Amino acid sequence: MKIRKYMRINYYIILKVLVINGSRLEKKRLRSEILKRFDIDISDGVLYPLIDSLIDDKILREEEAPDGKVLFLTEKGMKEFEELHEFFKKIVCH
Amino acid sequence: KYMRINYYIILKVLVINGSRLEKKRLRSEILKRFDIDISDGVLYPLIDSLIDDKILREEEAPDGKVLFLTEKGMKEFEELHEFFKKIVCHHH
Lengths: 94, 92
Known about the structure:
Organism of A, B: Sulfolobus turreted icosahedral virus
Order of helices and strands of chain A: HEHHEEH
CATH superfamily of chain A: Winged helix-like DNA-binding domain superfamily/Winged helix DNA-binding domain
CATH architecture of chain A: Orthogonal Bundle
Shape of chain A: globular
Radius of gyration of chain A: 13 Å
Method: X-ray crystallography, 2.2 Å
Oligomer: homodimer
CATH topology of chain A: Arc Repressor Mutant, subunit A
PDB class: viral protein/winged helix
Structural class of chain A: mainly alpha
InterPro entries (chain A): WH-like_DNA-bd_sf (IPR036388), WH_DNA-bd_sf (IPR036390)
Strand content of chain A: 5-15%
Number of strands of chain A: 3
Assembly: dimeric
Strand order of the largest sheet of chain A: 1-3-2
């Protein structure tokens, strides 16, 4: 296996927070969710570009809703999460 | 600069090998231990950068240059390991 572009902790964390919330989360809550679940504070200027890349690569989907935009994890994204989860488990965990 | 995960894998492979490893065996060891293929194009300059950071040191020897994780190096791995472990392993 070669190292691939999403093998970064912040991508894993974003995908994990989606899976945690049943593959659906309002965009305005992502930063808070990450902070409360992982104790990590990602700035806006770093976070939302990561989100954009995921959305434009069809890992995430975004639907415009009246009370904020909603993020969805796609089938492609769930498969990527599973790949990333196995990768990080293999190199980090016992 | 390179993706940080490479830095972690390098330090981990050194720690697993008792903080010492022949430079030539690093690529093979990473593949053996983790089934991860990392290029010499990434590995070698990254090693030089970690040497400038005093994270590794490089002894000359036959049958080749030997890499050593410093005390600084070991502390930096532990910190990063603890950081990743809480995120990834048995989290929530």
